[model samples]
Target: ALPSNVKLSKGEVEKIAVTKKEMFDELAQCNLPTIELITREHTFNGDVIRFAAWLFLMNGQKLMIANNVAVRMGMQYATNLAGNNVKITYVTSNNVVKLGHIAAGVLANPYSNKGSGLFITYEHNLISNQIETGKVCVLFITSLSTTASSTNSFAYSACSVPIEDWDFNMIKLTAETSCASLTAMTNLVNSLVPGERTRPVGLYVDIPGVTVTTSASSGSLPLTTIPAVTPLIFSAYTKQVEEVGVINTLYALSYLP
Candidate 1:
């Protein structure tokens, strides 16, 4: 098992470094998947879209650190969306070992969901749009290893609420962090808006038990300190016309009778 504060021996680090380089090579050869937009207003009644979108974005970032296990073990990965059959292939592990090894030099350090850590973070903000006058609902999903030895021991917590309204979404996933774990989370949010097609545009999970201190203030809102854990986040904000227009347009036209 990998230790939180232990340093890899020179030889071991070298070996892990080699593995990371190979994985990165494979990752570089393959183009990351894109987040697809459904025009007909949420035909699928699950959280796949939200989870897939986040995964899509996470995979797209060039700066993302790849795991040696994934690089050495990832046989074939493809994106499958409802009504869409677009798939991209990655290079084999044998072809990417060098890159994976090089990646270890950077990824071997501590990874956190904090402002100064390797993971990215985002703060949830309530919007008062005329159409949906509430906090935006979001779903996050990732794969979890059933074995305790292979799983992370931390819990992930999420909270979203309107500044003025009592309605809010606060939930936690403990020791279960995978695509399946997200099913219940999706259902919980769907219950709040039954029969309405809901697509979570944004989601956030604070780093487990982190406290943050902030001196900046807006209006009369009192200054509050939150846990120091920064959040590693993915969002739809990266989507732009030049990037998604072609596929979205093609899909729209094709679906139009």
Candidate 2:
């Protein structure tokens, strides 16, 4: 049976609820663009695990600064490898922060500033520390809002069936722009998992639109068609070793003196 906390919703995105005015003040300080906060809750092995997911979009130049810090800290890969726009998602679990209660607070007040954007102060502290330590730091907009149901395109689905019925060795790729690129990427993913039985459980793709412009040096300005740019891919598999070890490594690397 599906877990009590696990459920699927169409065109609705959930975010951690805000509890105070101070949170808003902090988020206003960052002063970036759009921020989307998604909170996911589920039960794993009798333990209730909650995750607060933050997704934000900002200018290309600002993204470059954050990417440098992330690379130096060995965090997630840069989001700009595919294009000038930036989309980054960060996750924090209940064990790392009081995410469960935070979610509850939002649900309780689903009206007072509910669905409105709220600031995430912890992220601000991290960015501030990086700058104080003599690193190029770019502030990410901590303020986040719920995606409008009418326009929300983000997908959410869940499964609770037995493990035997599920295919664990699957590589789902998003943002592949062309058939040629998809084939190449599929082949690359297949190589990563050699065995026929261990092949990817599925392959999913979405191609974003591309725009082109003629160069001024060529002569009179004219519209030109250019092939869509292939997106940069980041992939990962479930860890078989101690999960704590992985968490500790990333936690320590997230900040520097």
Candidate 3:
């Protein structure tokens, strides 16, 4: 019992204030021993700079959507991230995936074993000097050909940001349709973070089986009122040293109109 504009500094008034049923009856007489807890089923299979450095160390902001088979399977092998400081931004565009033909198809992928693929050539000269000093900037809309190859990769692809672009923190999207330029870049980052607006604004997509889609309404809608689709099928094959019968079909669309 201590009040009267409470001011305690020395020994916190002889410290002794622990409730909650007296700390659960002294943690049940503390005979603690048997404990078994095993839960495993984690998935975030790293790539794309270890998933944008694990979302910039769990939320300092980073968005990635670099398809074209993740820039031709992330350049191929070459790894390096010494003394890291994360501020990554690597968007893509130019309507047909051409960073010099993905650097000559990753130097002609002879099964990429020669270099072992993971973004080589010194990480494209450190992402082209961080995109010529402006720290990278290209922005959305990709696909004219090649849309998820290397046995259907890109894993569906999608991203969105708001909730004050990370500092104010809020991310949850799974129900559908928001990629209208990530809803105008989350309304230009919510008009420069209008008092944080109770967070919760970020969407992600890679629609193979569809999951994780959200919208508390952002902005810009009209890629024919966005819903997205790519339907095509026709496959056949049969040949064993002269039994000749091969018919292939591959459209593999992902974006563009």
All predictions: root-mean-square deviation over Cα?
21.9, 23.5, 20.6
Local accuracy of candidate 3 as per-residue lDDT tens digits, 143-187: 111212222111111232221221101222222345543453344
Single out the weakest 10-residue window by summed lDDT for candidate 2: 99-108
**Residue 181, candidate 1: C-alpha displacement in angstroms:** 16
Clashes of each: 24, 0, 16
Q: Which stretches of candidate 3 lie over 4 Å from their true place?
A: 1-106, 109-131, 138-141, 144-179, 182-257
User: Per-residue lDDT tens digits of candidate 2, residues 1-257?
Assistant: 23366554532222333433334343332464422221111111111111111112122222121121111112223333223233333333433311110110111111111011111111222212221221111111110112221221111111121212212122122224334323433443343213221111112212122111111111111111111221111211111111212222222232232
Query: Whose TM-score is greatest here?
Result: 1
Task: Estimate, for each residue in 52-88, the C-alpha lDDT of model 1 and write its tens digit.
Answer: 4433333433222232111111222222211111222
Candidate 1 runs further than 4 Å off: 1-12, 16-19, 30-131, 138-160, 163-257
Q: Using Cα atoms with residue i matched to residue i, what is each candidate's TM-score against the true structure?
A: 0.19, 0.17, 0.17
Q: lDDT of each prediction vs. the true structure?
A: 0.25, 0.21, 0.22
Error of 1 at 129 (Å): 15
C-alpha RMSD between model 1 and the true structure: 21.9
lDDT of 3 at 86: 21
What TM-score would candidate 1 get against the native? 0.19
